[PDB]
Enzyme design. Structure first.
Site, PDB file in Angstrom:
ATOM      1  N   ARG A 212       0.830  -1.206   0.000  1.00  0.00           N
ATOM      2  CA  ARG A 212       0.000   0.000   0.000  1.00  0.00           C
ATOM      3  C   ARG A 212       0.866   1.259   0.000  1.00  0.00           C
ATOM      4  O   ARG A 212       1.159   1.827   1.054  1.00  0.00           O
ATOM      5  CB  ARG A 212      -0.928   0.022   1.221  1.00  0.00           C
ATOM      6  CG  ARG A 212      -1.858  -1.171   1.349  1.00  0.00           C
ATOM      7  CD  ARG A 212      -2.681  -1.070   2.626  1.00  0.00           C
ATOM      8  NE  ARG A 212      -3.383  -2.315   2.944  1.00  0.00           N
ATOM      9  CZ  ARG A 212      -4.524  -2.719   2.383  1.00  0.00           C
ATOM     10  NH1 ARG A 212      -5.126  -1.990   1.445  1.00  0.00           N
ATOM     11  NH2 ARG A 212      -5.069  -3.872   2.760  1.00  0.00           N
ATOM     12  N   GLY A 213       1.279   1.683  -1.190  1.00  0.00           N
ATOM     13  CA  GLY A 213       1.983   2.948  -1.355  1.00  0.00           C
ATOM     14  C   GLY A 213       1.001   4.099  -1.491  1.00  0.00           C
ATOM     15  O   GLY A 213      -0.184   3.885  -1.756  1.00  0.00           O
TER      16      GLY A 213
ATOM     17  N   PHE B 269       1.117   6.382  -3.885  1.00  0.00           N
ATOM     18  CA  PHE B 269       0.838   6.507  -5.323  1.00  0.00           C
ATOM     19  C   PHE B 269       0.199   5.257  -5.948  1.00  0.00           C
ATOM     20  O   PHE B 269       0.057   5.183  -7.170  1.00  0.00           O
ATOM     21  CB  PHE B 269       2.128   6.846  -6.090  1.00  0.00           C
ATOM     22  CG  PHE B 269       2.770   8.139  -5.662  1.00  0.00           C
ATOM     23  CD1 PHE B 269       2.078   9.340  -5.762  1.00  0.00           C
ATOM     24  CD2 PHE B 269       4.071   8.158  -5.170  1.00  0.00           C
ATOM     25  CE1 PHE B 269       2.665  10.539  -5.368  1.00  0.00           C
ATOM     26  CE2 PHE B 269       4.666   9.353  -4.774  1.00  0.00           C
ATOM     27  CZ  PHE B 269       3.960  10.546  -4.875  1.00  0.00           C
TER      28      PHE B 269
ATOM     29  N   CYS C 207      -1.484   0.846  -4.975  1.00  0.00           N
ATOM     30  CA  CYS C 207      -1.426  -0.417  -4.243  1.00  0.00           C
ATOM     31  C   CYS C 207      -0.724  -1.490  -5.071  1.00  0.00           C
ATOM     32  O   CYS C 207      -0.723  -1.438  -6.302  1.00  0.00           O
ATOM     33  CB  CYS C 207      -2.837  -0.886  -3.887  1.00  0.00           C
ATOM     34  SG  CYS C 207      -3.791   0.311  -2.923  1.00  0.00           S
ATOM     35  N   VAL C 208      -0.143  -2.465  -4.376  1.00  0.00           N
ATOM     36  CA  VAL C 208       0.649  -3.522  -4.998  1.00  0.00           C
ATOM     37  C   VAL C 208      -0.085  -4.865  -4.885  1.00  0.00           C
ATOM     38  O   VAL C 208      -0.669  -5.184  -3.845  1.00  0.00           O
ATOM     39  CB  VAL C 208       2.051  -3.630  -4.348  1.00  0.00           C
ATOM     40  CG1 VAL C 208       2.997  -4.444  -5.221  1.00  0.00           C
ATOM     41  CG2 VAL C 208       2.641  -2.248  -4.106  1.00  0.00           C
TER      42      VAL C 208
ATOM     43  N   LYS D 149       2.287  -2.956  -9.219  1.00  0.00           N
ATOM     44  CA  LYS D 149       1.754  -1.708  -8.662  1.00  0.00           C
ATOM     45  C   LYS D 149       0.934  -0.922  -9.689  1.00  0.00           C
ATOM     46  O   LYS D 149       1.433  -0.586 -10.762  1.00  0.00           O
ATOM     47  CB  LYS D 149       2.886  -0.821  -8.144  1.00  0.00           C
ATOM     48  CG  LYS D 149       2.394   0.303  -7.239  1.00  0.00           C
ATOM     49  CD  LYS D 149       3.457   1.347  -7.016  1.00  0.00           C
ATOM     50  CE  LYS D 149       3.058   2.299  -5.911  1.00  0.00           C
ATOM     51  NZ  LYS D 149       3.974   3.464  -5.876  1.00  0.00           N
TER      52      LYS D 149
ATOM     53  N   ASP E 298      16.486   7.396  -0.402  1.00  0.00           N
ATOM     54  CA  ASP E 298      15.690   6.760   0.654  1.00  0.00           C
ATOM     55  C   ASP E 298      16.175   5.339   0.936  1.00  0.00           C
ATOM     56  O   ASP E 298      15.383   4.403   1.014  1.00  0.00           O
ATOM     57  CB  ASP E 298      14.203   6.748   0.273  1.00  0.00           C
ATOM     58  CG  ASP E 298      13.280   6.396   1.448  1.00  0.00           C
ATOM     59  OD1 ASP E 298      13.741   6.276   2.610  1.00  0.00           O
ATOM     60  OD2 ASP E 298      12.072   6.233   1.199  1.00  0.00           O
TER      61      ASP E 298
ATOM     62  N   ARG F  85      13.778  -1.137   5.266  1.00  0.00           N
ATOM     63  CA  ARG F  85      12.424  -1.291   4.708  1.00  0.00           C
ATOM     64  C   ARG F  85      12.340  -1.251   3.168  1.00  0.00           C
ATOM     65  O   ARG F  85      11.380  -1.767   2.587  1.00  0.00           O
ATOM     66  CB  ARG F  85      11.482  -0.228   5.291  1.00  0.00           C
ATOM     67  CG  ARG F  85      11.767   1.204   4.841  1.00  0.00           C
ATOM     68  CD  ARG F  85      10.691   2.183   5.335  1.00  0.00           C
ATOM     69  NE  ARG F  85      11.113   3.560   5.088  1.00  0.00           N
ATOM     70  CZ  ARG F  85      11.981   4.243   5.836  1.00  0.00           C
ATOM     71  NH1 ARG F  85      12.516   3.705   6.922  1.00  0.00           N
ATOM     72  NH2 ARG F  85      12.318   5.486   5.505  1.00  0.00           N
ATOM     73  N   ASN F  86      13.328  -0.630   2.521  1.00  0.00           N
ATOM     74  CA  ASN F  86      13.395  -0.548   1.055  1.00  0.00           C
ATOM     75  C   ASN F  86      14.407  -1.488   0.402  1.00  0.00           C
ATOM     76  O   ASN F  86      14.766  -1.305  -0.762  1.00  0.00           O
ATOM     77  CB  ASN F  86      13.719   0.886   0.632  1.00  0.00           C
ATOM     78  CG  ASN F  86      12.627   1.845   0.986  1.00  0.00           C
ATOM     79  OD1 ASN F  86      11.450   1.481   0.986  1.00  0.00           O
ATOM     80  ND2 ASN F  86      13.002   3.083   1.297  1.00  0.00           N
TER      81      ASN F  86
ATOM     82  N   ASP G  56      12.759   0.389  -4.179  1.00  0.00           N
ATOM     83  CA  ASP G  56      12.018   1.618  -3.907  1.00  0.00           C
ATOM     84  C   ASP G  56      12.778   2.828  -4.434  1.00  0.00           C
ATOM     85  O   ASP G  56      13.140   3.739  -3.689  1.00  0.00           O
ATOM     86  CB  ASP G  56      11.692   1.772  -2.415  1.00  0.00           C
ATOM     87  CG  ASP G  56      10.581   2.777  -2.163  1.00  0.00           C
ATOM     88  OD1 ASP G  56      10.566   3.400  -1.082  1.00  0.00           O
ATOM     89  OD2 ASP G  56       9.722   2.948  -3.048  1.00  0.00           O
TER      90      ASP G  56
END
Ligand SMILES: C[C@@H](Oc1c(N)ncc2c(-c3cnn(C4CCNCC4)c3)coc12)c1c(Cl)ccc(F)c1Cl
Length: 273
Positions: free
Chosen positions: A23-24, A26, A28-29, A42, A133, A137-138, A151
């Site tokens: 859930r980004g 810009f 959803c995946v 995405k 970034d 997490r990425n 990411d």
């Protein structure tokens, strides 16, 4: 014309919009299959925005490295919104994995993750690419536990929106606790500021996904760093590796190691551990 190698065909992609995985902001995946490759898909208005999207897709398509997550293609649809297709990473992001209590990497394994990120970043740097970034997490993990830096580019988003905070004036949500000092001041990012973020990522690895600076508020981190203060050495972090993290957080960006130097030094540390 030249985007043909990026664009995915008519009935070549199967997407499962019922089963969601990301859930980004810009988009959803979802899960997908590409003809047989397991994918993450995405979903992302006008011709000018689409053309921009295509152009950067061509640019990003030629980023190829075992420690960088690849773009498999794009599937723009006349009725709907464009789909970005990526390889499915079996073991998800690196932060959740090292926090996942059903798994149990060693200190050696955790150092080998950091070495892989440095290789992925070493590649990105050589192409003049700044991630902006870099964080646990990425970074993603495949079935072989190969770490893929991710990411950035088309699938660039904020998925874990807890660790992003708005700078009032500019109106942009930033990961301040992963950011170099000069990036917090000037709002400008360089490969040397990625090196800073890499030091923080190493801290994340060695602490097994603990959040950085839990007792410092998002608006106090600049002052905190200005004062000379840095993250503590984790209990199970080797000293030479903490020396490496400290070099990454040097006040002067000029004096920070390169990703090439870091691959060399961590690979030495890894080999003697
Ligand atoms: C765009 C998206 O790409 C993904 C890519 N390329 N691969 C896998 C995922 C998963 C995901 C969600 N769950 N899992 C696994 C974790 C272990 N248990 C089974 C499910 C994986 C979520 O997102 C995935 C993503 C997201 Cl949502 C967040 C950070 C990223 F770097 C990327 Cl690259």
């Amino acid at each position: 014309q030249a985007v043909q190698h990026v664009v995915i065909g008519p009935s070549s992609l199967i997407v499962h919009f019922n089963e969601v995985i990301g859930r980004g902001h810009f988009g959803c995946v979802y899960h997908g299959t590409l003809l047989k490759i397991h994918c993450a898909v995405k979903s992302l208005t006008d011709i000018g925005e689409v053309s921009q999207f295509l152009t950067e897709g061509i640019i990003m398509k030629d980023f190829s490295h075992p420690n960088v997550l690849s773009l498999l293609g794009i599937c723009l649809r006349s009725e709907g919104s464009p789909l970005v297709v990526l390889p499915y990473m079996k073991h998800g992001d690196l932060r959740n994995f090292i926090r996942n209590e059903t798994h149990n990497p060693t200190v050696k394994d955790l150092i080998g993750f950091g070495l892989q990120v440095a290789k992925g970043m070493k590649y990105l740097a050589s192409k003049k690419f700044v991630h902006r970034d870099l964080a646990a997490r990425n970074c993603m993990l495949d079935e072989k536990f190969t770490v893929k830096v991710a990411d950035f580019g088309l699938a660039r988003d904020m998925y874990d929106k807890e660790y992003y905070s708005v700078h009032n004036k500019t109106g942009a949500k930033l990961p301040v606790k992963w950011m170099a000092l000069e990036s917090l001041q000037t709002q400008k990012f360089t490969t040397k500021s990625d090196v800073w973020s890499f030091g923080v990522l190493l801290w994340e690895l060695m602490t097994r996904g603990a959040p950085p600076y839990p007792d410092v508020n998002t608006f106090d981190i600049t002052v905190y760093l200005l004062q000379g203060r840095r993250l503590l050495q984790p209990e199970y972090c080797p000293d030479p590796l903490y020396e490496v993290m400290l070099k990454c957080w040097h006040p002067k960006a000029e004096m920070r190691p390169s990703f090439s130097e870091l691959v060399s030094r961590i690979s030495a540390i890894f080999s003697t551990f």
